[PDB]
Each structure stands twice: as structure tokens, then as C-alpha cells.
């Protein structure tokens, strides 16, 4: 049933996740030297290409590849139109490897076909608390600890196979080429994300999506008048109230995040990060690349009332061409980047949120089940949707996990 994950070094069932107790590598331990040298073959009319991230020119053709072929829903209403300025702040944070960015084009004319990109992310992807309880009760802390160390591994993202190549196995050599780069860089575990079901996750949470523009979402989502506003004599009116947000935020204090921040900002973050199974680990240089505002991409304010900075918050921005429209031609979602809180109850942080991002013409909040995100879905009016983002790891073995036990926020 899978002709290429049943050959590569994951869970191949549920069941196997099910029953997995301590986190360490499935394949027994490789070298650099080891690794092929040369790329792994491809058919005489393609070649692979490794895009320059800082040439605007190469961010350009991959923005195109990914605006007319990246991830759509299966009723091609809605496609992700990731920006380039966007794309460039994913693909180039500090320390990347240019090698790690996979390119196929045909060798003609040069049209790309084909991408995906790995960078690195520093994790704790140690055994979870609840199995780490499990082994101290049956004297095996020693094994359950021996992989607790943050581990300098692979972030996956972006796979993509324009229409016209689906369905070829072009991917599995993608994913195989990807593979070898990393390993000849002497890093043997990636993470990646996925909305589809591959075989195994080790978590998976629904999407949430809060409504900021309902009359715009009413005029293009498939649903909207949702049925249940059927019973009012005038639905739109009374699904405009439901949503409606203050036009400036309640925390007194708040402000844009500044480079003087990123200390303080790194600090509350790791003491909340640190509380979760899966999370990142951030330098002062990854904090101030994935936090410090940049336009049209990420926005991130923080409380400081007394000079001091006690919480903090980050959305980015995912527009999606509209694909089937006569009045609209993208759909602006917020997506719940990361936070932390130290004085406010998080819900409280969480609606200066979304009053930034509705005062900023932003259409939905989005968000996964991650973090502590469901403790503020119903008061401040978050919907499940019908997606679920699913965690996956490349040669890694690990417990299955609850996904409030995950702090890793996939862009
Ligand atoms: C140590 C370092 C390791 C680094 C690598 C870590 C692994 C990274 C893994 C990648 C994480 C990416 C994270 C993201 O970016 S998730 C976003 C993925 N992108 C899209 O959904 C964009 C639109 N769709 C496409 O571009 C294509 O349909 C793709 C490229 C998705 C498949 O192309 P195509 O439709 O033309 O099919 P094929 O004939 O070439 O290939 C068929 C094989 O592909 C397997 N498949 C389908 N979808 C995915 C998927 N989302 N992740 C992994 N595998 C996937 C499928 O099970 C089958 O294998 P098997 O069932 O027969 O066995
Ligand atoms: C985030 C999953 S839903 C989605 C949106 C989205 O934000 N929506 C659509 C429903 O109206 C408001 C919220 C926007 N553009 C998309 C583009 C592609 C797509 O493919 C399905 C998918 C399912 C799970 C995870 C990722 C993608 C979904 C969406
Ligand atoms: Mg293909």
C-alpha cells in the first residue's frame, strides 16, 4: 500500500507508534562517508537545482511553483499563495544550508517542476513525561533519558510537484535527494508536518479557525450563512454581531516588538516552551528572525507595562488564492505563531490578537490544537475546522503524544 514509505525508516503502523515507550534513531547509526557523493539519479530530461534564497529572482520562481501548485483543498476552492517575502524569511533563517533547498527543472527550457526545502530547527524530542513515569516505575530512567538532550536536526517543508508531474513518483525522489543532503551534513532525523495522513504520526491536532471578516468568508467559504443562523430573521446581521471585535486592543501597554526585546522575549518563551514534550529551542539570532516584525509577514507585540516584558504575541500571515470567485481574489488568514504568557490569562493576550489582526484586514485566525491553544477556543469564539495538521518524524522513533503536548509551530 505504500511502495515508498514501507522502504524508509518510520512507523509503518499505528499500532507500532501505540507501543513505542522510549524516543532514540529506528536505523542503527551511519556516517557522512557512508552517504552517496553524488546526487541520486533522475531522468536525463529533468536535473536537479539548488535556488539562491538571497537572489529575489530564484525566491521569485519558487513563489510562482508553489502560488500555481502548492497544497489546495480537495473541493479546489482555496490554494496557499505563500508571498516571496515570506518565503524568503522561512527559507533563509540563521545558519541555513543553501544545499538543504531541492530544486528539479526540466533542462530545456528551465521550468521548475519540483521543490522542497529542509532548514535546521534545534528540538527536544526526548521521551515525553507520561513515558518517562513509565520507565522510572519499571527501573529503565537510564533508557528513557538517553535522548533527552535539544537535537541540531531537519525542519521539512514546502514539498511540491507542479500538476502537470503528479503522480509520476516524482516526490519520493525529492524526498530521497532531500535525504541524502542532510545526511552528508551529518544530520539523520527531520520533522515535517502534513494535513494528509502518511504513514505514522506521532501527533495530530484539528485546525481552529476564528472568523474576522464573516461577511467576506459567508461570500466564499462553502459554508457561510452557516445553517444555524437560518432560525433569525436576519442571519448575516446576527453572524456579524457574533464576530464582531473591539477596533484597539484592551492590554494596556502594548506594543510592537523591538530588537532590545529579543532577550527577554527568548526567555519567557523557553521557561513556556520548555513545559511541553516536543519543542524548539531558539538562540537570540532564531528569536529575532522568527519574531522581530516584518511586513506583510510577521507581526509580534508584546506587554511591557513597567518596563518590563511579561508576555508576548506572534501571528504570520498565509494568504490563499480564491479559486473559484467573482468578488474575491485571496483570503488573508493570521496564523497563531508563538506566545507566552506571565501576567495576563491567555485568553486576554490572545484577543489583543485578534483585534490587531482584524484592524490589520486580515480575514480568519487560524491555529492547530498545539501549545495551550484550546484553552481559549470557546470564549474567544474559535471553530474547529475540518483539517488536522499531523506531526511526523524521520528516523525517529516516539511515544504517540497529545498534540497540547507539542510547542513546535510549523509555518
Ligand atoms: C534525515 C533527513 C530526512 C529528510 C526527509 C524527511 C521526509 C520528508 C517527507 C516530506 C514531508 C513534506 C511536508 C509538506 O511539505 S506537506 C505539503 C505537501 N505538498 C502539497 O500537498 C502540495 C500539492 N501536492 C503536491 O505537490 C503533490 O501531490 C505531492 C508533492 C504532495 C506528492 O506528489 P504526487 O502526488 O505527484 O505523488 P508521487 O507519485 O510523486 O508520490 C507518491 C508518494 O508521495 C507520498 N505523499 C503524498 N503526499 C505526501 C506528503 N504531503 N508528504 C510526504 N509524502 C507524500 C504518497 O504517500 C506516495 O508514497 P507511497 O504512499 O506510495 O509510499
Ligand atoms: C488551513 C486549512 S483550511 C484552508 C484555508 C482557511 O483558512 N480556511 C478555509 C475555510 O474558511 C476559513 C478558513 C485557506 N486556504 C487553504 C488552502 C488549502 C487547503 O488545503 C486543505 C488543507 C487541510 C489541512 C491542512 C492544510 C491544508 C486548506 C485551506
Ligand atoms: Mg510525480
Known amino acids: 500500500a505504500h511502495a515508498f514509505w514501507s522502504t524508509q525508516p518510520v512507523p509503518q503502523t499505528e499500532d507500532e507508534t501505540e507501543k513505542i515507550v522510549f524516543?532514540?534513531?529506528?536505523?542503527?547509526?551511519?556516517?557522512?562517508?557512508?552517504?552517496?557523493?553524488?546526487?541520486?539519479?533522475?531522468?536525463?530530461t529533468f536535473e536537479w537545482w539548488t535556488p539562491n534564497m538571497e537572489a529575489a529572482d530564484d525566491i521569485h520562481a519558487i513563489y510562482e511553483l508553489l502560488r500555481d501548485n502548492y497544497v489546495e483543498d480537495d473541493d479546489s476552492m482555496f490554494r496557499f499563495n505563500y508571498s516571496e517575502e515570506f518565503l524568503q524569511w522561512a527559507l533563509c533563517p540563521p545558519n541555513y544550508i543553501p544545499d538543504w533547498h531541492v530544486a528539479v527543472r526540466r533542462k530545456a527550457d528551465k521550468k521548475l517542476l519540483a521543490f522542497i526545502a529542509g532548514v535546521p530547527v534545534t528540538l527536544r524530542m526526548g521521551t515525553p513525561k507520561y513515558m518517562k513515569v513509565k520507565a522510572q516505575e519499571k527501573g529503565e530512567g537510564e533508557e528513557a533519558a538517553k535522548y533527552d538532550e535539544p537535537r541540531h536536526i531537519c525542519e521539512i517543508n514546502f514539498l511540491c510537484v507542479h500538476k502537470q508531474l503528479r503522480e509520476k513518483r516524482l516526490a519520493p525522489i525529492l524526498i530521497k535527494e532531500a535525504?541524502?543532503?542532510?545526511?552528508?551534513?551529518?544530520?539523520?532525523?527531520?520533522?515535517?508536518?502534513?494535513?494528509?495522513?502518511?504513514?505514522?504520526?506521532?501527533?495530530?491536532?484539528?485546525?481552529?479557525?476564528?472568523?474576522?471578516?464573516?461577511?467576506?468568508?459567508?461570500?466564499?467559504?462553502?459554508?457561510?450563512?452557516?445553517?444555524?443562523?437560518?432560525?433569525?430573521?436576519?442571519?448575516?446581521?446576527?453572524?456579524?454581531?457574533?464576530?464582531?471585535?473591539?477596533?484597539?486592543?484592551?492590554?494596556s501597554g502594548l506594543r510592537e516588538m523591538k530588537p532590545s526585546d529579543v532577550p527577554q522575549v527568548r526567555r519567557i518563551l523557553m521557561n513556556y516552551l520548555d513545559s511541553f514534550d516536543v519543542?524548539?529551542?531558539?538562540?537570540?539570532?532564531?528569536?529575532?528572525?522568527?519574531?522581530?516584525?516584518?511586513?506583510?509577514?510577521?507581526?509580534?507585540?508584546?506587554?511591557?507595562?513597567?518596563?518590563?516584558?511579561?508576555?508576548?504575541?506572534?501571528?504570520?500571515?498565509?494568504?490563499?488564492?480564491?479559486?473559484?470567485?467573482?468578488?474575491?481574489?485571496?483570503?488573508?488568514?493570521?496564523?497563531?505563531?508563538?506566545?507566552?504568557?506571565?501576567?495576563?490569562?491567555?485568553?486576554?493576550?490572545?484577543?489583543?490578537?485578534?483585534?490587531?489582526?482584524?484592524?490589520?484586514?486580515?480575514?480568519?485566525?487560524?491555529?492547530?490544537?498545539?501549545?495551550?491553544?484550546?484553552?481559549?477556543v470557546e470564549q474567544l469564539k474559535f471553530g474547529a475546522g475540518d483539517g488536522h495538521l499531523r506531526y511526523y518524524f524521520y528516523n525517529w522513533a516516539y511515544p504517540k503524544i497529545k498534540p497540547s503536548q507539542v510547542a513546535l509551530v510549523m509555518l
Open 23 to 44: 524516543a532514540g534513531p529506528m536505523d542503527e547509526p551511519k556516517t557522512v562517508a557512508d552517504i552517496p557523493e553524488e546526487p541520486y539519479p533522475i531522468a536525463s
Open 179 to 251: 535525504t541524502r543532503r542532510v545526511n552528508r551534513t551529518n544530520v539523520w532525523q527531520a520533522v515535517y508536518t502534513a494535513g494528509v495522513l502518511l504513514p505514522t504520526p506521532y501527533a495530530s491536532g484539528q485546525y481552529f479557525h476564528r472568523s474576522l471578516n464573516p461577511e467576506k468568508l459567508v461570500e466564499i467559504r462553502f459554508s457561510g450563512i452557516p445553517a444555524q443562523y437560518q432560525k433569525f430573521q436576519n442571519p448575516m446581521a446576527m453572524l456579524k454581531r457574533n464576530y464582531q471585535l473591539p477596533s484597539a486592543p484592551k492590554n
Open 279 to 376: 519543542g524548539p529551542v531558539f538562540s537570540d539570532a532564531e528569536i529575532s528572525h522568527y519574531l522581530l516584525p516584518r511586513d506583510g509577514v510577521v507581526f509580534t507585540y508584546v506587554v511591557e507595562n513597567d518596563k518590563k516584558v511579561t508576555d508576548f504575541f506572534s501571528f504570520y500571515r498565509i494568504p490563499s488564492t480564491v479559486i473559484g470567485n467573482s468578488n474575491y481574489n485571496l483570503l488573508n488568514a493570521a496564523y497563531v505563531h508563538y506566545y507566552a504568557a506571565t501576567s495576563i490569562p491567555l485568553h486576554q493576550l490572545i484577543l489583543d490578537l485578534l483585534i490587531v489582526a482584524h484592524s490589520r484586514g486580515f480575514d480568519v485566525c487560524n491555529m492547530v490544537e498545539i501549545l495551550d491553544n484550546r484553552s481559549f
